[PDB]
Design a protein around this motif. Structure first.
Motif, mmCIF file in Angstrom:
data_model
loop_
_atom_site.group_PDB
_atom_site.id
_atom_site.type_symbol
_atom_site.label_atom_id
_atom_site.label_comp_id
_atom_site.label_asym_id
_atom_site.label_seq_id
_atom_site.Cartn_x
_atom_site.Cartn_y
_atom_site.Cartn_z
ATOM 1 N N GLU A 80 -4.389 13.189 16.829
ATOM 2 C CA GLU A 80 -3.604 13.918 15.816
ATOM 3 C C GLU A 80 -2.204 14.282 16.275
ATOM 4 O OE1 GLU A 80 -6.222 17.249 17.650
ATOM 5 O OE2 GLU A 80 -6.345 15.108 17.208
ATOM 6 N N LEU B 38 -0.023 10.652 17.050
ATOM 7 C CA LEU B 38 0.466 10.022 15.830
ATOM 8 C C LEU B 38 0.869 11.032 14.751
ATOM 9 C CD1 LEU B 38 -2.416 7.454 15.887
ATOM 10 C CD2 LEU B 38 -0.009 6.718 16.045
ATOM 11 N N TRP C 85 -0.549 13.529 12.935
ATOM 12 C CA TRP C 85 -1.405 13.524 11.746
ATOM 13 C C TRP C 85 -1.291 14.779 10.885
ATOM 14 C CZ3 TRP C 85 -6.862 11.498 13.743
ATOM 15 C CH2 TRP C 85 -6.757 10.115 13.976
ATOM 16 N N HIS D 210 0.746 3.104 21.400
ATOM 17 C CA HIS D 210 0.127 4.026 20.442
ATOM 18 C C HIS D 210 -0.998 3.401 19.607
ATOM 19 C CE1 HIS D 210 3.324 7.310 20.675
ATOM 20 N NE2 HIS D 210 3.833 6.331 21.399
ATOM 21 N N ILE E 74 -5.424 14.689 7.135
ATOM 22 C CA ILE E 74 -4.234 14.000 7.632
ATOM 23 C C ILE E 74 -3.113 14.153 6.598
ATOM 24 C CG2 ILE E 74 -3.222 11.845 8.537
ATOM 25 C CD1 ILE E 74 -5.958 11.072 9.583
ATOM 26 N N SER F 139 0.107 13.866 6.864
ATOM 27 C CA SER F 139 1.002 12.713 6.857
ATOM 28 C C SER F 139 0.382 11.618 5.986
ATOM 29 C CB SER F 139 1.233 12.212 8.285
ATOM 30 O OG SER F 139 2.111 11.098 8.307
ATOM 31 N N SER G 26 1.587 8.558 5.309
ATOM 32 C CA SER G 26 1.740 7.250 5.932
ATOM 33 C C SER G 26 0.648 7.007 6.976
ATOM 34 C CB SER G 26 3.125 7.128 6.571
ATOM 35 O OG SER G 26 3.284 5.872 7.213
ATOM 36 N N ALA G 27 0.395 8.019 7.805
ATOM 37 C CA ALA G 27 -0.628 7.952 8.847
ATOM 38 C C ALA G 27 -2.004 7.731 8.237
ATOM 39 C CB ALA G 27 -0.611 9.216 9.692
ATOM 40 N N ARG G 28 -2.306 8.498 7.190
ATOM 41 C CA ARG G 28 -3.566 8.382 6.465
ATOM 42 C C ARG G 28 -3.713 6.979 5.891
ATOM 43 N NH1 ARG G 28 -3.331 12.971 2.978
ATOM 44 N NH2 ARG G 28 -1.890 11.689 1.735
ATOM 45 N N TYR H 31 -2.343 4.221 7.006
ATOM 46 C CA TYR H 31 -2.611 3.275 8.088
ATOM 47 C C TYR H 31 -4.067 3.318 8.579
ATOM 48 C CZ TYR H 31 -2.910 0.969 12.548
ATOM 49 O OH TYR H 31 -3.322 0.172 13.584
#
Ligand SMILES: C[C@@H](CS(C)(=O)=O)Nc1ncc2cc(Oc3ccc(F)cc3F)c(=O)n(C)c2n1
Length: 345
Positions: free
Chosen positions: A185, A188, A190, A221, A243, A245, A247-249, A251
């Motif tokens: 978390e 990246l 999160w 990463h 999450i 974020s 974008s992170a979610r 991905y």
């Protein structure tokens, strides 16, 4: 009153220290080993490099001092002394920090080999003891790794590295130990992270001591997250919502789903109690991670756990973290903290 200071050029800087500190020798601001004739201790002395060059730097300087002055625990780095040659606030420009001279870090001890289970118990116990104390004050280490854990001959461990600048993007890049112990978390970004980021790190450290091998040695990463998710399973719907974020979610949902692996098949031959504890620390959802306080009470540390010998910390006021000040103001605050310092017994 004010001790007599003497001057000496060491690691390219002119060091000016009280006479009590003798036999200064460079060990790597910059750091010198010394003998404290007043205490009989071998000490490490750090001279901060340009401590007030910017708001960022003056505030970091204040944070480090504030952090080090608060720490009063057997398993955490403590401040033996802090001094400036300056006689007034107007003359004040240099800050020197003094702590115990440490022998070896955990990288020196593990050295590609497995440690005995009792040795792992003892080392992790002390880390968790120190973390319990740190977390009780709402302080988060954020950067726990073997190179930040120093140990003496009796295997008596201290947690080091508080108030440091924290690693930039370039030194978190690639096949680097600076990232292998970081919770996903925070690696990246999160979500807003909590104290249990440090517990992830303890898990990674404990696995390494058990096997002699880095647990998640990612070449970058993404590689690292893949190794993590291969062990712990891809996140469920519950964690994905957390999450924040987007974008992170997005991905994460692109990755092929994987179940949590059987830890007893990963850590072959290990104490089942060590395996159980590892499973409780290496939980992807930070909300569900074991705390330091809970982990100390785990059956794995039966031989060391003493609820009456695992103290909490005094309250640590970090309201200054959200405060906006000028360089001279952080500098005056820092100066007050230097002059008010009271040495340990
Ligand atoms: C030989 C090594 C073994 S090692 C790397 O500790 O494992 N000994 C050692 N011992 C103590 C420090 C303290 C340091 O930083 C300080 C932090 C807070 C202070 F008040 C004073 C400091 F000097 C430091 O940067 N190094 C390199 C140190 N090195």
């Amino acid at each position: 009153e004010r001790p007599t200071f003497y001057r000496q050029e060491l690691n390219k800087t002119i060091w000016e220290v009280p006479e009590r500190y003798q036999n200064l020798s460079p060990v790597g601001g910059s750091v010198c080993a010394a003998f404290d004739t007043k205490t009989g201790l071998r000490v490490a002395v750090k001279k901060l490099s340009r401590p007030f060059q910017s708001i960022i730097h003056a505030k970091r300087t204040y944070r480090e001092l504030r952090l080090l002055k608060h720490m009063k625990h057997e398993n955490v780095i403590g401040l033996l002394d802090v001094f400036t040659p300056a006689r007034s606030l107007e003359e004040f420009n240099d800050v020197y920090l003094v702590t115990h001279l440490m022998g070896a870090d955990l990288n020196n001890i593990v050295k590609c080999q497995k440690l005995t289970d009792d040795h792992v118990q003892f080392l992790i116990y002390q880390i968790l003891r120190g973390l319990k104390y740190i977390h009780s004050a709402d302080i988060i280490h954020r950067d726990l790794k073997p190179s930040n854990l120093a140990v003496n001959e009796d295997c008596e461990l201290k947690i080091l590295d508080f108030g440091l600048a924290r690693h930039t993007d370039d030194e978190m890049t690639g096949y680097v130990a600076t990232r292998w112990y970081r919770a996903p978390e925070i690696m990246l970004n999160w979500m807003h992270y909590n104290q249990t980021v440090d517990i992830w790190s303890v898990g990674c450290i404990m696995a390494e001591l058990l096997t002699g091998r880095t647990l998640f040695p990612g070449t970058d990463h993404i590689d690292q997250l893949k190794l993590i998710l291969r062990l712990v399973g891809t996140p469920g719907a519950e964690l994905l919502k957390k999450i924040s974020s987007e974008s992170a979610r997005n991905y994460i949902q692109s990755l092929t789903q994987m179940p949590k692996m059987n830890f007893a098949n990963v850590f072959i031959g290990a104490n089942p109690l060590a395996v159980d504890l590892l499973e409780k620390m290496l939980v992807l959802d930070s909300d569900k991670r074991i705390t330091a306080a809970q982990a100390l009470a785990h059956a794995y540390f039966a031989q060391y756990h003493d609820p009456d010998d695992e103290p909490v910390a005094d309250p640590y006021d970090q309201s200054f973290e959200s405060r906006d000040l000028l360089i001279d103001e952080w500098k005056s605050l820092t100066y007050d903290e230097v002059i008010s310092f009271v040495p340990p017994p």
